[PDB]
Each structure stands twice: as structure tokens, then as C-alpha cells.
RNA sequence: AGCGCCGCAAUUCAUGCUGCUUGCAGCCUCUGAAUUUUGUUAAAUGAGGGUUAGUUUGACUGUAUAAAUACAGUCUUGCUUUCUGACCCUGGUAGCUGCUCACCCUGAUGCUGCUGUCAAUAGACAGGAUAGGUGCGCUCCCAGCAAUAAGGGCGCGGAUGUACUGCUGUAGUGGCUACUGAAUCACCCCCGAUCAAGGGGGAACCCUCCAAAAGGUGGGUUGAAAGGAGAAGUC
DNA sequence: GACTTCTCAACCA
DNA sequence: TGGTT
């Protein structure tokens, strides 16, 4: 629900197979008419235009009678599998547009395990965590890890036995594991494809239930939202013999939420209203922060780009180059070519965490609460008019001299991912406890200027509301 | 010459250091910042393609420390990525299949650019990435080609011709499929596995100890970092 | 390749 | 293993 884990799955050869020649054979092609089903039928103008969609007409479109000839022999977690699948795609599509859609591959689609069980682990004589599926419990794989993420297994496997040993009174709300995804990966070379591709299953886990405080602030948010639920339509709809069933099971997760998990016990961050870490983007130096605290109007600490990157500053000019390299071989060969994929590492990617992990070290040592970041729609403008900025440094005046210089540089130096800059600061100050706020940068001055200026803005803009 | 980056150096500061008054004073030692000019100063940046379930970036528990952190003991697994090294190769057999070409001007976000011997533009062989230029790189500059960016001129040989064509070969430059040539590594080597599986032998350095100097003992090390993944679209 | 959406069940049979 | 919200 916050982070996600993976770890590849390897088994008999027998197991692989049915697995395989019932996934391509048997599901695939049922999300392909789910979608087709779905694309056709009617009232679709309706949907689109009143935005959303029901909750259960893809389960309604079940009604066809999924047991269908070419349909027998999957288990129901499966169908649901597939329901959920179709679902997400025809939300997120639906919400896209404010048509008939496939599959953007040609690998099988994967299984979605929303329910947190359906992952029924072991450990066989050999020690390995191993891990079966609701319906294939005949299919027992072996798990194959990172050290990095081992530990995430094995408190998936002692929260399983937690509440099997106490009689089911341990709520499954509070397991870490939330989603299951059993993702066929691509595999070079030829033969069978289940002896030549790789299977590996992708655990979503929630990051606040690894220790005990974060365990009681999601215990709280679960309590909040089952009892505004059931407050909410108990009052009203008369109920019947099916949905006082989920009042008494809401019920039951309210009770069993609180008889809660021995947890590892690290203290909650808690930081401080007055401190704001602003994070001001620009073209020059992608990233300057400042710690400033608004009470006495100072500033903690400066940290430009270099700081923040410290022994990977080299990373920086290697992805300059690269997306100068990427930039012209693009627009070479957009004379109807087709090249390589060129510049498929993430190095992007990297240099975006390193600067976020940095950044939200730096919040954590002078122990603020907050983080102010620019708003990506504004963005677009500033790099704009900064370039400028930059041109009147060293030709003031000079228009001629301030165009060329301006292209020159945007040759040098293009923008720099500050999408996903932001959204991996958002993930790491939401995985720490820090507050993400939005600011407006001034689009003159330094960058320890602007940096300083956007906190204490954001900072001005809260104290109203 | 231009731009970007690296370091260097005198220059001014704090984001740093001291001092008590806890925000003021001075210094530049560490850490850094700022258009301040330089590149024999040693100086940090930078190499074409490919090679490891490769090592470290871990979790639990207990400690001093307000945490941040450092030590201790147990466990350990290999997923997806970014560097840093070392190593291997600058290929072969075939099939197919793209784009382009009468000739002449301008030359593009075009192509090519290493070393030593043979040799005629063209290439063979042995090496091989400190592969044209600045410290390094470029969509910049140099040289050659330029039909394979746009543009312009004028030929023949065909057209009922009004329309459009051929001047195209043992052509140039690319893409794909299948087979096998080398590396399948993280201090080095041999053996074996690649849906699991490690086992063994060695080399330098440091430490505990026997010590009687010498010699011997066991232990540890011989690069690190990051992660939220699926699915569908927008440019 | 850089942005834009959506999901991130929990008890009972 | 399988099921309704």
C-alpha cells in the first residue's frame, strides 16, 4: 500500500506448467473478453461522461456466465483475479478522459491477490520460505529474495502463524502484507515459455505496520474509517439479510483491530511546525534546500547540490551527458527511423533517490515535520525563466548574444526529472513521517534564496488555514 | 573561437571554527558557497560494445548518547536497478529485408576519425581502446565523404504525351532471424550447478597468542550505493 | 523517456 | 477452496 517488495519464485517444472498453461490459455484470454465485454456494452456514453463507473458491473458482466466451456477449471480467486484487473483498467481509463483497450504486452497478465491470505507460506526441510496460492494449494513454489527484503517474508510468515495461533483474534487489517502480484518476467532465449521465463511474485506492504507506533496510527485510521462506515449506512437503507452481514464483520475487524501484534517498538519521528525544509528546483542546480525555521525568521543550514549527493555528484554530469546523448540521437533519427532503446538505464531514477534519501536525511537531523517542495504544473515556467535569467548574467543587454546563449545552454543543460524528483521525496518523507507541503518559488534570486523563500511562503500560506 | 563540466589558485563569505553574552567578533584549519582568472600545477573529471543468483549498502535484541549515532550477540536468500574495478571482443555462417544513388553546386542536431607493419583510393595482419581538437565533453570546431536534412542547375536515354520515368551494381550504409566464437568474474585458480549448489586449493596485509630472537598459532580483510511494484493512457 | 490515473479486503463458509 | 459487500 506504501512499498512494494519482490522476490522471484521457482518450483517443480510440472507446477510451472499448469500454472503457466492456465494462466495464457485460461485467464488471459478472460481479462481479453472482459475488456471487449465491457468496451461493448451499452450505457458506456453514460459512464464516460458522468465519470467513474459503478462498482460492480464488471461482476454484473459476470453474469454471461463466466463458466463458459472455454472457462472450467480455474479456481475463483483467479476470476477474481481477472475481475480486478479489468476493474483498475476501466477506472483509470475512464478517469483519464475527464473505446476498446487490450493488453499493452504480450506476457500473460498477471494475478492480483487483493484479499491479504491466498499466500499461505511454509518453510520446507530445507529452511526456504516457500508459498502456495488459494486453489493452487497443489502448486508450492520456494521463495528467492534479497537479504534486503527477506525480513518482509518472514514477518508475512509469523503474522500468518500469530493469527492462526490465537484462533483467528489477531485482525487481518493489521497484517503487513496487503496485495499479492504473480508477474510472468521476461526471459532470454527459446523453448517453453515457463522454462524460459521467470515468475516473480510482488508483495505490497504497508511500511507503518513494521513497527508498533506506526501499528497503533493505522490502527486508529482503521478505526475511524469502519466506524464512519458503519455509522453512516447502518443509519440509513434499511438493511437486509446481506449487508447487516457486513455490519456484524466490520464489527468483528473493529473488536479484532485491538487485540494488536508484539511489534518491533521504534519511537514515532516527530518533528517540529516551526522548521520547513524547502527544497527549491531550478535549471542550473536541480535542486537547492534550506532548513529554515520560521519562528525566528533564520535559517538552520544551506545544502546545495553537491551536499546533497556528496560521493555521486559524478552521477549529475553522467546524466547531463546522457540526456544530451539521448536528446540528439532522437531528434537524428526522427528522420522515420527506428533505433535501440537507447538510454534504458535509471540513472535518472537513481540520482532522484539518492537526492530524496538525502534530502530527507537532512529533515530527519534538524527534525522537521515538513518539507516544502514546487508545484510540477508552475515548473514548466520557471526553467523558462531562469534560462533567461541566466542569459542577462553575461549578456545584459544583448539580445542577440542572450538568444544564443540560451540555446547553447539548453543544448547543455535540458530539464531534469523534476517529476519524479518529487514523487520520490513525496515517498520518502511519507515513509519517514514528514510532511509534504506545496509552495510557491519566486522566480528570481539564488537558489538559497529561493529555497528559503518557498519554505517561509509555504509556511506564511499555512498560519491562515 | 563558443558552450557545459572537472580540478587549481590567489579573493569575499557561511552552510563551517572558535568565545561566551547565544548573536555578536575574528580567523580560513576541516566542511562548503559565491561569473574570479588560469590549465607542467598533478587534477579531478572522461573511455566503443559485452561478461558474475558478484561484494557492501540488511532485520531482530541489548547498550552510552535527547536522538543522529558507535559497539555487542543471533539470523541471513539469490528480486529490480546505479556506479567503481578486472576481464573478453572489435567477429564467423547463412539466409532474408530496409533507405539511398545520371552528373554539378551550398553542406546537415548527417557519416567516418586509435597504434604499428604491408598496401593504391580500397583493404590484409598484428595489437587495441588515455580512439580527431581544449584538462574533459558537445547538437561546437578540423579533415575527408556526403545519395542516404532541407535547397538550386542542367544532362542524356523512354514516354501517343499533357502525366511520369531509367541511367542500379558483382553499389553504399543499416535492420531482423537462426546457428557458435570469448569473457559467466569482485583478491586469484581448479571442479560442479544455472528452476539452485556449492565444494576445494591458494596470494598479500593486519590483529590475538606461543614467544627466546628466529619461526609457529588461530581470527579478520583485499570497492561501494538505491529501491513502490503492477496495469492501463498522454505528450 | 517524462507525466497521468487506479488499485493496494477482511471475515466467514 | 470459495463467497457477498
Given at each position: ?30 481479462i481479453?473478453?472482459?475488456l ?49 484487473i479489468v476493474d483498475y483498467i476501466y477506472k483509470s481509463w ?7 483497450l ?364
Open positions: 500500500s506504501q512499498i512494494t517488495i519482490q522476490a522471484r519464485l521457482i518450483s517443480f517444472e510440472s507446477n510451472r506448467q499448469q500454472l503457466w498453461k492456465l494462466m495464457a490459455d485460461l485467464n488471459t484470454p478472460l481479453n473478453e472482459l471487449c465485454q465491457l468496451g461493448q456494452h451499452p450505457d458506456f456514453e453514460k459512464w464516460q461522461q458522468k465519470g467513474k463507473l459503478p462498482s460492480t458491473v464488471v461482476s454484473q458482466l459476470c453474469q454471461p456466465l463466466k463458466t463458459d466451456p472455454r472457462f472450467a477449471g480455474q479456481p475463483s480467486r483467479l476470476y477474481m483475479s481477472a475481475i480486478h475512464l478517469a483519464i478522459q475527464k473505446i476498446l487490450t493488453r499493452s504486452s504480450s506476457l500473460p497478465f498477471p494475478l492480483v491477490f487483493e484479499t491479504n491470505e491466498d499466500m499461505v507460506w511454509s518453510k520446507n526441510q530445507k529452511g526456504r520460505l516457500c508459498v502456495h496460492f488459494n486453489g493452487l494449494s497443489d502448486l508450492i513454489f520456494e521463495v528467492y529474495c534479497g537479504n534486503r527484503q527477506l525480513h518482509w517474508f518472514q514477518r508475512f510468515l509469523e503474522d500468518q502463524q500469530t493469527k492462526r495461533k490465537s484462533k483467528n483474534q489477531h485482525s487481518s487489517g493489521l497484517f503487513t502484507l496487503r496485495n499479492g502480484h504473480l508477474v510472468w518476467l521476461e526471459g532470454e532465449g527459446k523453448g517453453e515459455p515457463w522454462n524460459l521465463h521467470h515468475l516473480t511474485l510482488y508483495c505490497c506492504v504497508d511500511n507503518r505496520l513494521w513497527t508498533e507506533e506506526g501499528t497503533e496510527i493505522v490502527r486508529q485510521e482503521k478505526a475511524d474509517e469502519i466506524t464512519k462506515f458503519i455509522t453512516n449506512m447502518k443509519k440509513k437503507s434499511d438493511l437486509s439479510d446481506t449487508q447487516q452481514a457486513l455490519i456484524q464483520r466490520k464489527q468483528s475487524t473493529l473488536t479484532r483491530i485491538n487485540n494488536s501484534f508484539e511489534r518491533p517498538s521504534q519511537p514515532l519521528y516527530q518533528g517540529q511546525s516551526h522548521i520547513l525544509v524547502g527544497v527549491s528546483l531550478g535549471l542550473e542546480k536541480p535542486a537547492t534546500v534550506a532548513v529554515v525555521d520560521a519562528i525566528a525568521n533564520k535559517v538552520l543550514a544551506y545544502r546545495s547540490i553537491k551536499q546533497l549527493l556528496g560521493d555521486n555528484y559524478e552521477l549529475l554530469n553522467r546524466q547531463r551527458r546522457q540526456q544530451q546523448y539521448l536528446s540528439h540521437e532522437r531528434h537524428k533519427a526522427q528522420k522515420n527511423f527506428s533505433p535501440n532503446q537507447f538510454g534504458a538505464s535509471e540513472l535518472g531514477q537513481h540520482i532522484d533517490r539518492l537526492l530524496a534519501k538525502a534530502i530527507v536525511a537532512l529533515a530527519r537531523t534538524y527534525k522537521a515535520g515538513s518539507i516544502v517542495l514546487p508545484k510540477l504544473g508552475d515548473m514548466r515556467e520557471v526553467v523558462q525563466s531562469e534560462i533567461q535569467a541566466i542569459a542577462e548574467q553575461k549578456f545584459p543587454g544583448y539580445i542577440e548574444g542572450q538568444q544564443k546563449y540560451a540555446k547553447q545552454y539548453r543544448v547543455n543543460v535540458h530539464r531534469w526529472s523534476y517529476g519524479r524528483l518529487i514523487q520520490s521525496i513525496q515517498s520518502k518523507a511519507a515513509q519517514t513521517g514528514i510532511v509534504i507541503e506545496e509552495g510557491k518559488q519566486p522566480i528570481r534570486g539564488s537558489p538559497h534564496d529561493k529555497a528559503k523563500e518557498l519554505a517561509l511562503s509555504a509556511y506564511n500560506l499555512r498560519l491562515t488555514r
